[PDB]
Amino acid sequence: YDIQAWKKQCEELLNLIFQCEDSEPFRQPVDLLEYPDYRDIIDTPMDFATVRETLEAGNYESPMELCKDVRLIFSNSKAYTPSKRSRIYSMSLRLSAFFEEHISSVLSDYKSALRFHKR
């Protein structure tokens, strides 16, 4: 029932994500010189370095907020892809499956800890 445990669990999951080859297109903001129309489609850019920095700055109050930003990385890739068969989008789908598989217990434990705190 540790209300704070999610933070280190998210730091470790982000470390695993950065070790994965599939995260390379998502480690830093999308390069606007390479993709000049990016901001015509994507309203809110997001990347894993921004997520990690927000977490380390103490600017996430819960793992749900972190999860919303990571999911935004994936929805931006889906929205920007010209094809569902594109390389970068395909990498995003595998990374999303890995992220969802690992964030589930982090969210469950945090929500359970909060419920115990308010019992």
Ligand SMILES: COc1cc(Br)ccc1CO
């Ligand atoms: C299952 O192995 C994966 C896959 C992805 Br994508 C991201 C990280 C890991 C962990 O090394």
